Symmetry: C2
Subunit: 230 residues, 2 copies
Amino acid sequence: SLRLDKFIAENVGLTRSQATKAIRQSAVKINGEIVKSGSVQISQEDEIYFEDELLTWIEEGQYFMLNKPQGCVCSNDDYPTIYQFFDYPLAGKLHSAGRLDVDTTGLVLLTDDGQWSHRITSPKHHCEKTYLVTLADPVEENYSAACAEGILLRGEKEPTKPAKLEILDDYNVNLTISEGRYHQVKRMFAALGNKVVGLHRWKIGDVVLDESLEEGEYRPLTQSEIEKLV
Amino acid sequence: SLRLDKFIAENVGLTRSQATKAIRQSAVKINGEIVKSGSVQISQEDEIYFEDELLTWIEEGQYFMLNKPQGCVCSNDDYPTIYQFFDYPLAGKLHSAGRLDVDTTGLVLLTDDGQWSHRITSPKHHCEKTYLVTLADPVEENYSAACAEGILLRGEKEPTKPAKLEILDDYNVNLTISEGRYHQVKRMFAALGNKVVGLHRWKIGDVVLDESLEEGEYRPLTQSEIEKLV
């Protein structure tokens, strides 16, 4: 067996200090339990989680893009999960690099590489995520400026970071955000007096969801896509 | 008349900088519409909202505690509101010091004092709120430690601040939090693998909900209670 902090540092690509801080911030679990000590000994009989993503003991280097349908979640284990779209043992070696809510559709990246996935979801790297947002009511003239300036939402201590809004038509826009607060997009438009009736992610960084993928289908990423994301 | 930013600063008790930021961040409305220009002139007849709480220009000093029932919301706007329990014009000169979701019951403080209410709900402050929480599945031994040491919720950059959990029985607990993150209580228990099926607030600071109040009933706060929340 080996130390939890050594495992987290090496598998998530963090310094021992960063791994220690993550552990202190309740970001690390052993078999579903929050663990606050980096000295705890672990083995392959243990399932290790970082920000709720299951890390594999046998990393090989696998990367995929999935077109997620509604009605399923991005957890390894109420609703079915995205792992139903993969066969075992492959399904058991993967975790996600940015989850999508149960009814949000689109681009979900799956990988067995914890260093790669963390770089993608790390706030510091502020990776851009673009969503096709369909609204119940017509877009208003103040939307673009509000998104660019930032919106102070109830339940938040800070306003949303500047986001880029692109109007497609009166009921559809593309919104690019470099963060992912709880139900952020839904809350942003609700704050503006509208309602999100459709949410589809089609881009992360410079990687676009393969439009030939039906919902539930996935394909391996190309080396170019893998490299562009980090 | 006066500038929207002067009104917000004086009424909510913010610095001119904070007021300017809140307005630019779409947290302020004039007669139900978001206004991002602090220079806009307003009269006593205009209805000003800060994060959807209706403020009062000429404060008289009213403070009440209401026992909120399920099926109603805390706002002036799908369901009936808690202001239905008040007669006009009083109902139109009050706002809350901490809102509860539609099916959450219990203690809601109503007032026309923007500074008093702001301090109670301000993220910069740490006013304690205690809830009787009923869960779908049995509570677990480690719940207390988890709440005391912090839980990292999806959508958050930092773990929840220290909270106090008291187990009452197999499906009920009292949880005291000094934070106000979006749907925090529900998300905390969801993170622990459970589900809140019942939620009743009975204490804010050292002020306890009057047990003699039937749902829908309210009473004025005593001077002692008003001061305890100062």
